[PDB]
Amino acid sequence: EITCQENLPFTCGNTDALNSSSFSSDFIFGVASSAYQIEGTIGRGLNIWDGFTHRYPNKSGPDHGNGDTTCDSFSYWQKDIDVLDELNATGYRFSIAWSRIIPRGKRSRGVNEKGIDYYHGLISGLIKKGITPFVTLFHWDLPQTLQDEYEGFLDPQIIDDFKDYADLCFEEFGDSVKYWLTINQLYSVPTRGYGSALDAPGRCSPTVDPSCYAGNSSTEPYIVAHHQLLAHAKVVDLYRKNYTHQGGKIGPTMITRWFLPYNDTDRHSIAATERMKEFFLGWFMGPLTNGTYPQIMIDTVGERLPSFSPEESNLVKGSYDFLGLNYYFTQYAQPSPNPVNSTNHTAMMDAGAKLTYINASGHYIGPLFEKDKADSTDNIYYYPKGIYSVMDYFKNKYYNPLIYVTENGISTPGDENRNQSMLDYTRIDYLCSHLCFLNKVIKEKDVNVKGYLAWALGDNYEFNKGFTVRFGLSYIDWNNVTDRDLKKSGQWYQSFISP
Amino acid sequence: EITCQENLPFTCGNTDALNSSSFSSDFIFGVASSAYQIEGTIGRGLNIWDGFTHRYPNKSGPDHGNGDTTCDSFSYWQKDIDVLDELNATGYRFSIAWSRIIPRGKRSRGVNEKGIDYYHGLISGLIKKGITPFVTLFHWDLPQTLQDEYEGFLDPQIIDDFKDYADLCFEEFGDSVKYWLTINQLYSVPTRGYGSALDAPGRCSPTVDPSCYAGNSSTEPYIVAHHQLLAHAKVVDLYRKNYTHQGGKIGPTMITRWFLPYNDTDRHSIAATERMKEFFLGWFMGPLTNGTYPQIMIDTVGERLPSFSPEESNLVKGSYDFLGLNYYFTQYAQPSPNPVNSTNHTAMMDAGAKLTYINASGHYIGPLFEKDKADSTDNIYYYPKGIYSVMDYFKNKYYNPLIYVTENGISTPGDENRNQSMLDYTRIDYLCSHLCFLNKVIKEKDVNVKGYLAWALGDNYEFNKGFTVRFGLSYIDWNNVTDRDLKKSGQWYQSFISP
Ligand SMILES: *[C@@H]1O[C@H](CO)[C@@H](O[C@@H]2O[C@H](CO)[C@@H](O[C@@H]3O[C@H](CO[C@H]4OC(CO)[C@@H](O)[C@H](O)[C@@H]4O)[C@@H](O)[C@H](O[C@H]4O[C@H](CO)[C@@H](O)[C@H](O)[C@@H]4O)[C@@H]3O[C@@H]3OC[C@@H](O)[C@H](O)[C@H]3O)[C@H](O)[C@H]2NC(C)=O)[C@H](O[C@@H]2O[C@@H](C)[C@@H](O)[C@@H](O)[C@@H]2O)[C@H]1NC(C)=O
Ligand SMILES: *[C@@H]1O[C@H](CO)[C@@H](O[C@@H]2O[C@H](CO)[C@@H](O[C@@H]3O[C@H](CO[C@H]4OC(CO)[C@@H](O)[C@H](O)[C@@H]4O)[C@@H](O)[C@H](O[C@H]4O[C@H](CO)[C@@H](O)[C@H](O)[C@@H]4O)[C@@H]3O[C@@H]3OC[C@@H](O)[C@H](O)[C@H]3O)[C@H](O)[C@H]2NC(C)=O)[C@H](O[C@@H]2O[C@@H](C)[C@@H](O)[C@@H](O)[C@@H]2O)[C@H]1NC(C)=O
Ligand SMILES: *[C@@H]1O[C@H](CO)[C@@H](O[C@@H]2O[C@H](CO)[C@@H](O[C@@H]3O[C@H](CO)[C@@H](O)[C@H](O)[C@@H]3O[C@@H]3OC[C@@H](O)[C@H](O)[C@H]3O)[C@H](O)[C@H]2NC(C)=O)[C@H](O[C@@H]2O[C@@H](C)[C@@H](O)[C@@H](O)[C@@H]2O)[C@H]1NC(C)=O
Ligand SMILES: *[C@@H]1O[C@H](CO)[C@@H](O[C@@H]2O[C@H](CO)[C@@H](O[C@@H]3O[C@H](CO)[C@@H](O)[C@H](O)[C@@H]3O[C@@H]3OC[C@@H](O)[C@H](O)[C@H]3O)[C@H](O)[C@H]2NC(C)=O)[C@H](O[C@@H]2O[C@@H](C)[C@@H](O)[C@@H](O)[C@@H]2O)[C@H]1NC(C)=O
Ligand SMILES: *[C@@H]1O[C@H](CO)[C@@H](O[C@@H]2O[C@H](CO)[C@@H](O)[C@H](O)[C@H]2NC(C)=O)[C@H](O)[C@H]1NC(C)=O
Ligand SMILES: *[C@@H]1O[C@H](CO)[C@@H](O[C@@H]2O[C@H](CO)[C@@H](O)[C@H](O)[C@H]2NC(C)=O)[C@H](O)[C@H]1NC(C)=O
Ligand SMILES: *[C@@H]1O[C@H](CO)[C@@H](O)[C@H](O)[C@H]1NC(C)=O
Ligand SMILES: *[C@@H]1O[C@H](CO)[C@@H](O)[C@H](O)[C@H]1NC(C)=O
Ligand SMILES: *[C@@H]1O[C@H](CO)[C@@H](O)[C@H](O)[C@H]1NC(C)=O
Ligand SMILES: *[C@@H]1O[C@H](CO)[C@@H](O)[C@H](O)[C@H]1NC(C)=O
Ligand SMILES: *[C@@H]1O[C@H](CO)[C@@H](O)[C@H](O)[C@H]1NC(C)=O
Ligand SMILES: *[C@@H]1O[C@H](CO)[C@@H](O)[C@H](O)[C@H]1NC(C)=O
Ligand SMILES: *[C@@H]1O[C@H](CO)[C@@H](O)[C@H](O)[C@H]1NC(C)=O
Ligand SMILES: *[C@@H]1O[C@H](CO)[C@@H](O)[C@H](O)[C@H]1NC(C)=O
Ligand SMILES: *[C@@H]1O[C@H](CO)[C@@H](O)[C@H](O)[C@H]1NC(C)=O
Ligand SMILES: *[C@@H]1O[C@H](CO)[C@@H](O)[C@H](O)[C@H]1NC(C)=O
Ligand SMILES: *[C@@H]1O[C@H](CO)[C@@H](O)[C@H](O)[C@H]1NC(C)=O
Ligand SMILES: *[C@@H]1O[C@H](CO)[C@@H](O)[C@H](O)[C@H]1NC(C)=O
Ligand SMILES: [Zn+2]
Numbered sequence: 001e002i003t004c005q006e007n008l009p010f011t012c013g014n015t016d017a018l019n020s021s022s023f024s025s026d027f028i029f030g031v032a033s034s035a036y037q038i039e040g041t042i043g044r045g046l047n048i049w050d051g052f053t054h055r056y057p058n059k060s061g062p063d064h065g066n067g068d069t070t071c072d073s074f075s076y077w078q079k080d081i082d083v084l085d086e087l088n089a090t091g092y093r094f095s096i097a098w099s100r101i102i103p104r105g106k107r108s109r110g111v112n113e114k115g116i117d118y119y120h121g122l123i124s125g126l127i128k129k130g131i132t133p134f135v136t137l138f139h140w141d142l143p144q145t146l147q148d149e150y151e152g153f154l155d156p157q158i159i160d161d162f163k164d165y166a167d168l169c170f171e172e173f174g175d176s177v178k179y180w181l182t183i184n185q186l187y188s189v190p191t192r193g194y195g196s197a198l199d200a201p202g203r204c205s206p207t208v209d210p211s212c213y214a215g216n217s218s219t220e221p222y223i224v225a226h227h228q229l230l231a232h233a234k235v236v237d238l239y240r241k242n243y244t245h246q247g248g249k250i251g252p253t254m255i256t257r258w259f260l261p262y263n264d265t266d267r268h269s270i271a272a273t274e275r276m277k278e279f280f281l282g283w284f285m286g287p288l289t290n291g292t293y294p295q296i297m298i299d300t301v302g303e304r305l306p307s308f309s310p311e312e313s314n315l316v317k318g319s320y321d322f323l324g325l326n327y328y329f330t331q332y333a334q335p336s337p338n339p340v341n342s343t344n345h346t347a348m349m350d351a352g353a354k355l356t357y358i359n360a361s362g363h364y365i366g367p368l369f370e371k372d373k374a375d376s377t378d379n380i381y382y383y384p385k386g387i388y389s390v391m392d393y394f395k396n397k398y399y400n401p402l403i404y405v406t407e408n409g410i411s412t413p414g415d416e417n418r419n420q421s422m423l424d425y426t427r428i429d430y431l432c433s434h435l436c437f438l439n440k441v442i443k444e445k446d447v448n449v450k451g452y453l454a455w456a457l458g459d460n461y462e463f464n465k466g467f468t469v470r471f472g473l474s475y476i477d478w479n480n481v482t483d484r485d486l487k488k489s490g491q492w493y494q495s496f497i498s499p
Numbered sequence: 500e501i502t503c504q505e506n507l508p509f510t511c512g513n514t515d516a517l518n519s520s521s522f523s524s525d526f527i528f529g530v531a532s533s534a535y536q537i538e539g540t541i542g543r544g545l546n547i548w549d550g551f552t553h554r555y556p557n558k559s560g561p562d563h564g565n566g567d568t569t570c571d572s573f574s575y576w577q578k579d580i581d582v583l584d585e586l587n588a589t590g591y592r593f594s595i596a597w598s599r600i601i602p603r604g605k606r607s608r609g610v611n612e613k614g615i616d617y618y619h620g621l622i623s624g625l626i627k628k629g630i631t632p633f634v635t636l637f638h639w640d641l642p643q644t645l646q647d648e649y650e651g652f653l654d655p656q657i658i659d660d661f662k663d664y665a666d667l668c669f670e671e672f673g674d675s676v677k678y679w680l681t682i683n684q685l686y687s688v689p690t691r692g693y694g695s696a697l698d699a700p701g702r703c704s705p706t707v708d709p710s711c712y713a714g715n716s717s718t719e720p721y722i723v724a725h726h727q728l729l730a731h732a733k734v735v736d737l738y739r740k741n742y743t744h745q746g747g748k749i750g751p752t753m754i755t756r757w758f759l760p761y762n763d764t765d766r767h768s769i770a771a772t773e774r775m776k777e778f779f780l781g782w783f784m785g786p787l788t789n790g791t792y793p794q795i796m797i798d799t800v801g802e803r804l805p806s807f808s809p810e811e812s813n814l815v816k817g818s819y820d821f822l823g824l825n826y827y828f829t830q831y832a833q834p835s836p837n838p839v840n841s842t843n844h845t846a847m848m849d850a851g852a853k854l855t856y857i858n859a860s861g862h863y864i865g866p867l868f869e870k871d872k873a874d875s876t877d878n879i880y881y882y883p884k885g886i887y888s889v890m891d892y893f894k895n896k897y898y899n900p901l902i903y904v905t906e907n908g909i910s911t912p913g914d915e916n917r918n919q920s921m922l923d924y925t926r927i928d929y930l931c932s933h934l935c936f937l938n939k940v941i942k943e944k945d946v947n948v949k950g951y952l953a954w955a956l957g958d959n960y961e962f963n964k965g966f967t968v969r970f971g972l973s974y975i976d977w978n979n980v981t982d983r984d985l986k987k988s989g990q991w992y993q994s995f996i997s998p
Contacts, residue, residue: 041553041556042553042556044554045554045643045647046549046553054540054545054549055542055543055544055602056541057540057541068553068567103554105647144545144644144647145647148544148603148604148643148644149603214609
């Protein structure tokens, strides 16, 4: 019988008690990254994260940081491989920058051969060290031209441009890459990019944020989410019909959270909690498993919710071989009004829930996850059991899928000095406590989880935060980015992997 | 009788001998800037100078500097006005960033009202201080979307997109702006952007520079130059047909140089010198004054030189109310081969001339203009009499045009400390020696020159050089860009203007 801790102090950093041998022999362990966050702009065209961070510098991070140079994995990709080799990692998730291989967005406009060569060399280097690539086609970095031509995922033109991009990736890299992710965290671009305008492209209703250049936070999230699902599904169909000879697998990436009632004896909070599962997870998993949106969304969102035609429904339903599930934290849910006629209405209000990290009796859900220095009542707290609850839920609700955990990690402040930054015991505690619960759910519930990729390989540009937080298991000096030095967490993870 | 010095030391910095009263009462004196170089990316879309500097950082400058933040004239435009007011300047040339007012390039995709408001406030502030705006529509900063959709000026689609942009500018600003420049330095984008790939967009033949993403240095300069002339002419026709009520004037900007024979008794060097006038100036001035390219270009360039239809010829011929002439330096010309079959052939080779600053007997043409630390034999030297020779030539060859000198200036090294940078006596010498010759040519040759705008108002991002050189008459601290402090040159110019 497995017992896992939910509260500090944690004792799961002892590799005598928890290590890779605790999991099945074939289980993949590694780390993850994304292209905007690590590569730099050298050698690629411009994308909407360049555009957004440059047009709206205060939204890029408090330091106005951006991905212009970052850790320079364009130059230092071998050093990334070296970190993975030091870890004895068996997996690495990275993304392909669309703007690096098709700078002009649309494939008929030409490809960048040198960009293709960059990923060929990375892939070959990974495989030579026994590391399985998990490759994200689209980690938010849409070529700027496509956003300017037709507003990107707002328009159905995205589907064929994404398909042609993906086809190039399968053609060039699929002989070696056997695990593909389509779109990173399906929920995020619709809500943050087109709802709150916290993320690229930065569209919203005028009274939500007067700096947005255009948008409608009540309608556009739904349009964009719908186009994401269709573009994803078209790419999965292309893969499975035209690239079956490659013997690989493809799936979407979900951001997952668990949800608990703010008041577990209050029917209204219980109802809000179940609505959140539907609106947060079901928005995408309903279509992916059934070809339809959840009934509560149909009912609430009404005419703002697009319909799938019968052909589209069939294309989207079952459009995955596996799911990449990202998991960071869990929230308490309580009821909240949905003011659909307000000029500041957002799609996120349609769930009719307010989310917190403290419940009605004052209990904080778990240890600190992210401190918010402008408003401490907005601090985020984590909940290790949430990974158990999420995986169990996916197995039970969503037809026993094959799952890879494609991100899990925690930040430390960029205000810490290097010695403090390397002494990242809070990261060991977060990672081990989640791995304990992941082992527990695999054993107890028989969830088909086959790998785990921690966020992040190394310090990088963090969306929305610049360089003001660090997520890496290896440390990067922003004054001289060449080295990636394993932190205490990376050293722990090395021992966990090879105990 | 006016006597002007050609060699150090200069004595024209004494405002007792040379000042604004030496010129006609109405003569305009001021300074110049451009949008990429001063504003920053905040509040605008991305253009090809963002793209180029980010994709090819070693081409942006030795420091890899770019226009991301620069002197932040987006925030500090009032401080620019304050410099002009301190100078008692009567003119200011600035450019409108296309990407600030139409971030998506094509006007039907929407305008950025806040971008329009930025230029309204600048213009209103200038006029309130008695400063005449000279506004450049296109100072190289093409929206990236247009380059990615159709390769910008390489394609005739540019004509209508440029026209619609210009129409918006005339509509929004032409009630106050009475002097418009269409395209900055017509020669530069074709040759540097599409020939040598030193400038955005960075296209060339593969063996000219293997880093270019695409191109053909032998053909594309001519295509781009032709489209520039057509786009320019379409905008001038629009202005003069639809905005005549505004009572303003419009013209192109030329980069001018004089040319002297490397050996003034050698017929081959004399011939190369005359070819250079045709290939450098006539490439554009032939079309602008006659609707045709120079015969030597027709003959040499052959099928690589586009033809104007009769309608196009008529549109381009006479398509100016005035000429903005930029002038920095003069070169000696000697013959050089034109290897049209070589894979590294460039359009610039078609003139059949090699350009130097030292003549056959070892004479350097004038004082140092720009030191080249990697190769000192490549240092640039200036020639004050060249402004006299250029203006005389334009009057005689090109039908006595109305001229404004729209740039004239010199750099100092970014390695100098602030005190050295403020003690910019070399800039006083350059500016005064040219102003002496400009007064001389107006008086002796009756050239219709009505104003002079020195480059630059303040230190800025210099194309190709980052922040490694300074051109300003006012100093900017890159660690804190708010202030613009008049240098010795700015203080001299203040006294010259109001002696
Ligand atoms: C998994 O996918 C299944 C579909 O493959 C989902 O089942 C479908 O659920 C639909 C409701 O979401 C059912 O549609 C309703 O059908 C009634 C019945 O219509 C038939 O007979 C009538 C009925 O009197 C005729 O008019 C109609 O032409 C048919 O002959 C409809 O009125 C109802 O329409 C109203 O409600 C819609 C909102 O739900 C409004 O959008 C619409 O304007 C109406 O106001 C709805 O019809 C659907 O209307 C929208 C049209 O675009 C669509 O084509 C039309 O079908 C549907 O019958 C059922 N299909 C079958 C094969 O069972 C399934 O839903 C889950 O299970 C069903 C049983 C129900 O409990 C759902 O609430 C629940 O979500 C999906 N499963 C999951 C887990 O999501
Ligand atoms: C100012 O613009 C003026 C035009 O408005 C320029 O004058 C034009 O100069 C053209 C040469 O550049 C002259 O064209 C040539 O015409 C002969 C004569 O053709 C007529 O009679 C013939 C002749 O036997 C017929 O075949 C023809 O159909 C006419 O009936 C042409 O052969 C000659 O074509 C050859 O040379 C071209 C290169 O110059 C090649 O491109 C072509 O393939 C041939 O190999 C040329 O014809 C032009 O050919 C190209 C066609 O696209 C074009 O439509 C055709 O006209 C032209 O006659 C003259 N027009 C007039 C009204 O004078 C003027 O040029 C300057 O002055 C002229 C007198 C001459 O000294 C030029 O060298 C000099 O540049 C321009 N001024 C300036 C300062 O540039
Ligand atoms: C978890 O949710 C539960 C269920 O909602 C909370 O318990 C409920 O708390 C209500 C007060 O917020 C209780 O109602 C009140 O009852 C007193 C005594 O009769 C009365 O004077 C009040 O006016 C009020 O009555 C309601 O007034 C509004 C009417 O529309 C409605 O019909 C009346 O119910 C309610 O009885 C209670 N329900 C149960 C089943 O206990 C619970 O609140 C926490 O516990 C209750 C017992 C009370 O001590 C609250 O102070 C305490 O906050 C909530 N838990 C937390 C931690 O918030
Ligand atoms: C400015 O250009 C002028 C005109 O080209 C240069 O003068 C010419 O210089 C040529 C040498 O580069 C002289 O030709 C030579 O004459 C000597 C004496 O006969 C002879 O032994 C040489 O072989 C050579 O002759 C030529 O050989 C090639 C044949 O194809 C051709 O037919 C022959 O001409 C030439 O006479 C001379 N022309 C004139 C009109 O003086 C001038 O060069 C400078 O001055 C000349 C006089 C001489 O001292 C050169 O050393 C000196 O460089 C050049 N000025 C400069 C500063 O480069
Ligand atoms: C968001 O788009 C919606 C749908 O176009 C706008 O909502 C509608 O408002 C139009 C004018 O009031 C109403 O007549 C419709 O009844 C509404 N339709 C629905 C589906 O709600 C909404 O106003 C736009 N929001 C913004 C801020 O522009
Ligand atoms: C530049 O474009 C030109 C014109 O397309 C190319 O020149 C031609 O080369 C084609 C193949 O040799 C020849 O058959 C033609 O005779 C040439 N045409 C002319 C007008 O010169 C040239 O090869 C291209 N250069 C590059 C480096 O691609
Ligand atoms: C690995 O952890 C298991 C418990 O899951 C333990 O029995 C085993 O001895 C540990 N391995 C090492 C090498 O410490
Ligand atoms: C940040 O930038 C936007 C312009 O993009 C501006 O609207 C907003 O006032 C600024 N935010 C703060 C908090 O200053
Ligand atoms: C598959 O490839 C063939 C050849 O390009 C093409 O005809 C077919 O439309 C493609 N398929 C998809 C997505 O099925
Ligand atoms: C608009 O929304 C903000 C946050 O969503 C809220 O605090 C404010 O009360 C709302 N105002 C109206 C008019 O509803
Ligand atoms: C930067 O870091 C690399 C790796 O440690 C080192 O070899 C190089 O010398 C350093 N550069 C400077 C300028 O210190
Ligand atoms: C790498 O992991 C394999 C598989 O568990 C193990 O056999 C090998 O010893 C490990 N290597 C190192 C250096 O840890
Ligand atoms: C201006 O320069 C002229 C010579 O061009 C001179 O005569 C005049 O006195 C100078 N003005 C002043 C105020 O020094
Ligand atoms: C500079 O950058 C380009 C890549 O854009 C590369 O081809 C070239 O080698 C580099 N130049 C030098 C001198 O290192
Ligand atoms: C002028 O404006 C009118 C109204 O848009 C338009 O019909 C005409 O085509 C425009 N003109 C040019 C460039 O002449
Ligand atoms: C190619 O051009 C470079 C500079 O233009 C020149 O130095 C070199 O000799 C040329 N090579 C050939 C093959 O002509
Ligand atoms: C920056 O420069 C401005 C103008 O001199 C000054 O007022 C401001 O205090 C300076 N900022 C810092 C941080 O020194
Ligand atoms: C501004 O120039 C005008 C015109 O020459 C002159 O009358 C006025 O005195 C000057 N003002 C200053 C402060 O120099
Ligand atoms: Zn940048």
